[PDB]
Amino acid sequence: LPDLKIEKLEEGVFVHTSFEEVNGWGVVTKHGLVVLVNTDAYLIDTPFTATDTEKLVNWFVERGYEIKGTISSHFHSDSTGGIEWLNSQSIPTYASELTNELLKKSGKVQAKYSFSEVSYWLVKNKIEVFYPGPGHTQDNLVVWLPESKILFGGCFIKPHGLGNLGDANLEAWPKSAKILMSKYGKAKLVVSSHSEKGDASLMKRTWEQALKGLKE
Numbered sequence: 333l334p335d336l337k338i339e340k341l342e343e344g345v346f347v348h349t350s351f352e353e354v355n356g357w358g359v360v361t362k363h364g365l366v367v368l369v370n371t372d373a374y375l376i377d378t379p380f381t382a383t384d385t386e387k388l389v390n391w392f393v394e395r396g397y398e399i400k401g402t403i404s405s406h407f408h409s410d411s412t413g414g415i416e417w418l419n420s421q422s423i424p425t426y427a428s429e430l431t432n433e434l435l436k437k438s439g440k441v442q443a444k445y446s447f448s449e450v451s452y453w454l455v456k457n458k459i460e461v462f463y464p465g466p467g468h469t470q471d472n473l474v475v476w477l478p479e480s481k482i483l484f485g486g487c488f489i490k491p492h493g494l495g496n497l498g499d500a501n502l503e504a505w506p507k508s509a510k511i512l513m514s515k516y517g518k519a520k521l522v523v524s525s526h527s528e529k530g531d532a533s534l535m536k537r538t539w540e541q542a543l544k545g546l547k548e
């Protein structure tokens with residue numbers, strides 16, 4: 333129902349929230365980020381639709397920002413739904429090589445640029461992309477903002493029910509959650525795809541939910 337929402341978290345970090353009815357999960361609430369580096373804007377996940385992605389880009393363009401790049405945390409539509417529209421506007425889209433091949437295999441449009449690195453800087457000292465290992469999906473990534481100490485966990489952070497298990501790796505998820513906890517204990521805020529933002533303990537809650545879900 334409602335249009336995409338944009339909310340400031342702090343200087344240069346915004347949450348974008350979009351809503352989509354998806355067969356037999358009802359209306360899904362999806363959070364992404366927009367990160368500002370000087371007058372450049374980066375989309376951390378696309379909203380569900382071309383429409384919401386256009387509203388999001390136009391909001392930052394009208395406020396003087398250039399959209400320099402988007403990164404999709406994984407291949408599902410709540411992270412990649414905007415890619416086709418961004419490509420048509422020549423806004424650089426990024427995904428892991430694995431994510432792009434999963435999109436291809438699913439008959440979806442791919443990000444224009446891909447990368448294979450476990451840890452890499454999308455923007456040096458500002459936006460780090462990290463693969464903790466499989467969980468929600470084989471390809472799931474997190475995004476770390478070193479200056480704000482904010483972690484975007486995407487659909488991997490699941491403090492209250494794991495959600496769509498269709499493409500999940502329950503065997504790996506607890507191991508991947510421990511790897512994430514070990515790397516980003518210093519997160520002062522964890523933003524997830526579908527849960528309220530919270531403290532570093534959301535990584536421990538995710539570890540617990542992963543184990544619980546694995547134990548059938």
Ligand SMILES: C[C@@H](O)[C@@H](C(=O)O)[C@H]1NC(C(=O)O)=C(S[C@@H]2CN[C@H](CNS(N)(=O)=O)C2)[C@@H]1C
Nearest residue numbers: 354357359360361408409410487494495496526
């Ligand atoms: C949307 C689609 O793209 C998929 C995706 O790729 O993520 C599905 N993946 C996940 C997920 O995150 O694991 C979900 S279920 C999500 C987990 N808890 C949320 C409860 N709150 S609410 N008001 O429904 O927002 C709903 C999607 C259906």
Ligand SMILES: [Zn+2]
Nearest residue numbers: 406408468487
């Ligand atoms: Zn997903």
Ligand SMILES: [Zn+2]
Nearest residue numbers: 410487525526
């Ligand atoms: Zn999701």
